Design an enzyme around this catalytic site. Structure first.
Site, mmCIF file in Angstrom:
data_model
loop_
_atom_site.group_PDB
_atom_site.id
_atom_site.type_symbol
_atom_site.label_atom_id
_atom_site.label_comp_id
_atom_site.label_asym_id
_atom_site.label_seq_id
_atom_site.Cartn_x
_atom_site.Cartn_y
_atom_site.Cartn_z
ATOM 1 C CE1 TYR A 1 -6.690 -17.736 -11.086
ATOM 2 C CE2 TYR A 1 -5.097 -19.493 -11.535
ATOM 3 C CZ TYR A 1 -5.560 -18.470 -10.718
ATOM 4 O OH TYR A 1 -4.908 -18.184 -9.541
ATOM 5 C CE1 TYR B 1 -9.361 -17.988 -3.658
ATOM 6 C CE2 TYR B 1 -11.163 -17.663 -5.231
ATOM 7 C CZ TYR B 1 -10.341 -17.174 -4.218
ATOM 8 O OH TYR B 1 -10.495 -15.884 -3.760
#
Ligand SMILES: COc1cc(OC)c(-c2cn3ccc(N4CC[C@H](NCc5ccncc5)C4)cc3n2)cc1Cl
Ligand SMILES: COc1cc(OC)c(-c2cn3ccc(N4CC[C@H](NCc5ccncc5)C4)cc3n2)cc1Cl
Ligand SMILES: [Zn+2]
Ligand SMILES: [Zn+2]
Ligand SMILES: [Zn+2]
Ligand SMILES: [Zn+2]
Ligand SMILES: [Zn+2]
Ligand SMILES: [Zn+2]
Ligand SMILES: [Zn+2]
Lengths: 255, 230
Positions: free
Chosen positions: A150, A239
Site C-alpha cells: 500500500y 479498511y
C-alpha cells in the site's frame, strides 16, 4: 469505441509507471465510465513537503543460507517471516525484517520477497453492482503470498485528521505499528491498491515491512493473501474504520 | 525579486518531475528570471503491439534485444557497450524479470542531480551536473511534443528545438520548444559530452523511438552538459 481507446491508453500509461513484474490490465464491460484523472501511479511512498524518508540501513547479514542462519530478523529481535516457498508464517502485528542492500545474500534469498515487487498480474475492472472500480487477479494467488504494498503520500497525523473530515471509508492508513506520528494517503497518488474494494471478509492482510528503512515510525505496508485466491476473484481489504454498519452483497452486517 | 522567483520555479520543476535526482536552479551572473511559457514533462507528449522475454538471467539468455536481432546494450556496470546507431531494446512490462534486470536503465529515469544555471558568456540558460558521471552512462531522455514531419516544417520556419525521430522513419519529430525536461536547457557544443541512443521499452514501433542521452566521456562534478545540434 472511444471508451475502449481511452481505457487501453490509461492501461498503457499504468504499465509504463509501474516497475514490478506483474502486468496491469483495465476492463469495463458495465458502463461508459473512462479513466480517472484523480490518479497518479507510484511504486513507492511519496513524501509530503516536510517528511524525510531516508533509507538509512548501514549493516546487513553475512549468512550463506539466510533461512537456516540467524539472519536480519534475529538481529532485529524477531522471527523470520517466510518459509522456503515465499509464504508468510508470522502472526499479525509482527514486523517483517527483510534483507537489504548491505546484506551479502543475492536476490534469490528467501528473506527478499516484498522488495522483488508484485509478481501477480492484476486487473482494474468496473464492478457490476455500483461499487465503482475494483481489483481482481488474473492468476492463482497462493495462500499467505505477497501481493502488493500500500503506497501513497506520507503525511502527519494532523494532516490526516484534517483530510479525514472530507467525507470512515478513506484512503488514509495510519502507520501506527509503534508511532502515531505518520499516515499514508493514497487518494491522489498510489498503486493498484488505490482501486481495491472494502470487505468484511477480506482476502488481503497487512504487515509492516523494514528493508533499507529501519525507522519504526515509517514502516512500508505490504498486503498478503489470507487464503488461496483463484484466477478471476476480487481482491478485498477491510479498511472501514471502527455500532458500526459495514458498507461492503452478503455483509456480516456490523464491524 | 529575482531570487524568490527562481526558487518558486525550482520547486515547481521538482513537483512536476517523476525521477529520483533533484533539479537545482542557480543564477550568480545576471538579473533575468524564469522563462514565461515552459512546462516541464517526463515523457513524450502526443499531439491529437508488444512482446516480453521469459529469461531468468536476462544478461546471458536470449532476451528482448535478441528478439529484435541485436545485442544487449549494457554490461555489468550499467554502461552502454553498443556502438552509435544501434537501438536499445530494454526489458518491459510484459517481461518476466523485475527491476533487478540489467536491461532496465533508461526506464528507471534520470539518475543524477542536475542544475539549470545562467551562463557567464551570453549563451542564456545551461545545464551542469552536481555529481561525477561515468562515461557511457545514462543521463536523461530528450522529451517534448511529438508531431508530424508536416507540422514540424511549419513550426520550423521560426539552433532549433526540433529533433527528427529518423532511426527508421521520416514521419515523426520531437519539438521541445514549449514542453520538455531539463534537456530543453542543454547548450550546443561541437565537442559534446552527450550522445543519442534510440530506445524501445513498451513501444516496439520503430517510427517512435524514445531518445536517451548518454555520456560520451567522464563528466566531472560541476561540468556543463552539451549536445551537438545544428
Ligand atoms: C492498507 O490497505 C488498503 C487501505 C486502503 O484505504 C485505507 C484502501 C482503499 C481503497 N479504496 C478505494 C476507494 C476509497 N474511497 C474513499 C472515497 C470514495 N468513496 C472511494 C477508499 C479506499 N481505501 C485499500 C487498501 Cl488495499
Ligand atoms: C536530442 O538532444 C537535444 C536536442 C536539442 O535540440 C535539437 C536540444 C536543445 C537545447 N536547446 C537550448 C536552446 C535552444 N535555442 C533555440 C534558439 C533559442 C535557444 C535550442 C536547443 N535545442 C538539446 C538536446 Cl539534449
Ligand atoms: Zn541473512
Ligand atoms: Zn538474506
Ligand atoms: Zn540479511
Ligand atoms: Zn460487509
Ligand atoms: Zn530477458
Ligand atoms: Zn529483463
Ligand atoms: Zn525482456
Amino acid at each position: 469505441a472511444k471508451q475502449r481507446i481511452a481505457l487501453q491508453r490509461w492501461q498503457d500509461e499504468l504499465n509504463r509507471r509501474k516497475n514490478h513484474k506483474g502486468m496491469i490490465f483495465v476492463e469495463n464491460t458495465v458502463d461508459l465510465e473512462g479513466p480517472p484523472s484523480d490518479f497518479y501511479y507510484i511504486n513507492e511512498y511519496k513524501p509530503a513537503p516536510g517528511i524525510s524518508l531516508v533509507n538509512e540501513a548501514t549493516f546487513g547479514c553475512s549468512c550463506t543460507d539466510c533461512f537456516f542462519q540467524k539472519c536480519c530478523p534475529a538481529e532485529a529481535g524477531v522471527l523470520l517471516a517466510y518459509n522456503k516457498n515465499q509464504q508468510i508464517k508470522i502472526p499479525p502485528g509482527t514486523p517483517i525484517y527483510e534483507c537489504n542492500s548491505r546484506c551479502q545474500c543475492g536476490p534469490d534469498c528467501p528473506n527478499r520477497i516484498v522488495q522483488k515487487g508484485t509478481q501477480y498480474s492484476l486487473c482494474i475492472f468496473r464492478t457490476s453492482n455500483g461499487r465503482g472500480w475494483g481489483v481482481k487477479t488474473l492468476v492463482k494467488i497462493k495462500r499467505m503470498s505477497f501481493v502488493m504494498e500500500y503506497v501513497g503520500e506520507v503525511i502527519t497525523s494532523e494532516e490526516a485528521e484534517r483530510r479525514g473530515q472530507f467525507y470512515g471509508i478513506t484512503y488514509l492508513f495510519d502507520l501506527d505499528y509503534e508511532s502515531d506520528e505518520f499516515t499514508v494517503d493514497a487518494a491522489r497518488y498510489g498503486n493498484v491498491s488505490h482501486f481495491v474494494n472494502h470487505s468484511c471478509d477480506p482476502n488481503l492482510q497487512v504487515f509492516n515491512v523494514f528493508i533499507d528503512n529501519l525507522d519504526t515510525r515509517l514502516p512500508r505496508i505490504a498486503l498478503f493473501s489470507t487464503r488461496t485466491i483463484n484466477a478471476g476473484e476480487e481482491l478485498t481489504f477491510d479498511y472501514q474504520m471502527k455500532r458500526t454498519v459495514c458498507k461492503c452483497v452478503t455483509c456480516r452486517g456490523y464491524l
